[PDB]
Amino acid sequence: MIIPVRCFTCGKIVGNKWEAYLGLLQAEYTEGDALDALGLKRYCCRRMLLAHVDLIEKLLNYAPLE
Amino acid sequence: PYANQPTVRITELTDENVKFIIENTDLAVANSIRRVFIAEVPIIAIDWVQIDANSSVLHDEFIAHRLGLIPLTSDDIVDKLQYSRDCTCEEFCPECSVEFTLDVRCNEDQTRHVTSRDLISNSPRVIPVTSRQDDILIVKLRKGQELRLRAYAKKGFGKEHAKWNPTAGVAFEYDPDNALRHTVYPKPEEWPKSEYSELDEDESQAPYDPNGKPERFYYNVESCGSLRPETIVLSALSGLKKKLSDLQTQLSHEIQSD
Amino acid sequence: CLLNGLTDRDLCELNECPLDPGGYFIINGSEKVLIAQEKMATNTVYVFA
Amino acid sequence: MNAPPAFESFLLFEGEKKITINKDTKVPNACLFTINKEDHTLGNIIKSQLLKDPQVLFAGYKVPHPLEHKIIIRVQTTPDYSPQEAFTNAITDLISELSLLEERFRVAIKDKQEG
Amino acid sequence: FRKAPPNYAMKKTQLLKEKAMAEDLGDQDKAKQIQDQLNELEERAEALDR
């Protein structure tokens, strides 16, 4: 529902990289290049950004008030 | 009938990871230092979260869980603080803990991004990693929601929980050529040469070596950002030395009592 | 139904998600679904032995 | 619901001894050291150090059960060298070695930074 | 006195307006209901975009 804070297997902080990864994908980069541009060497930490689903948006659509 | 004279040589020192080499030491010592790197390294981290008003879309415990995982720079504070369990006072005293406060409320129309930068610490030096590269996203708030809480941090080590795990990933590897045959390749040609392999590209693996002991352990400790890597190594060495010292004292007392 | 051809905006505002397949009744506040039963086709001659 | 707390793996409980010596009877000069609230970290290195010592005929540790935080170290020396002093010597030299390693690592770092 | 659109009844208000327009056979009432529904939809779209 939200990007984790750390890679389950490794432990490297990955939570602070979701917005950057999205920006890099948006401008021109491709995933395979954006991932190493952020500095994710081990394939264990890449699954965090590739596989992660972003449901928090759908959750925010149900605004309590206004 | 005594110990050995290990040597050390750093190959790559940065503010993010350290790659060094240890020579003339036993495998047990190397792997033990590794396990101390991962498990027994003092570090600060959030451990007590009191939530006063949480109107976000995530659970109450989700916020505390995430806040448990945000690293905190402890370069010179972990050594000074004392474990809360061994403190001699009630409530989280500043001498034995670091307090945190967070109070955000999405008023404008655009969705907020409550990042670690909202964690206003009382102490100057104990802050999340934002000094010098976005910040750890905690939760997203929408107009009308709010999140008020305060949490305290305390010293622990990875063995108790992962939050106290300073190292991202320790790359430990010795004898890059399979000279001691500790592993048997069914088809050696099919395997790629190790980064530390001195062997040329023709031969697949070094010839067997009967009278050969493991030396030249290669380390690639990688700090998560809480402590500096060389600081992790120094703390691990000091902690292991202390554990041995305590054990020796206990054994001495036991023998004397007998 | 009240959500016949309704945009995802209104669905979200009605505390419902656009992904819900639907096609299930609400009795006493429980989602009831009818299992498709099967039987022998009618008006067809079968010769069993 | 019955998950034990995380502090039971390293913190001693009131009344439990950190280290207990128990002489064995099957062979002369053989003792079993029992350590509470420890793991392979603090047993494997001692095992190796005891192996280095030539006067130590047998040396080995074990973990009775992973869920239990306890280890047993068995040591058997020549008749003229009690296992207690073997253990003390092993720990003393191991501490000396780690201190020397720390000093060398520190000097290597301080030289690596602009040097 | 309290205006209707505020704040969570946008979809309910739109459905009510559509139902009233469908029920009403008058042309002027139908046009007014359609215009009100279109205005409500536009306001909701603007709020969502913001």
Next chain:
Amino acid sequence: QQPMIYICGECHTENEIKSRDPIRCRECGYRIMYKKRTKRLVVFDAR
């Protein structure tokens, strides 16, 4: 002196509801309303 404040379903407006009273929002008028968080010492361990 606690009148057991409630939160309207869709208005998200507070209401003062006492015993032996209908459950409705002060305005519009709906039949759904949730309670407000306790005031107790909700303390979690970030474990």
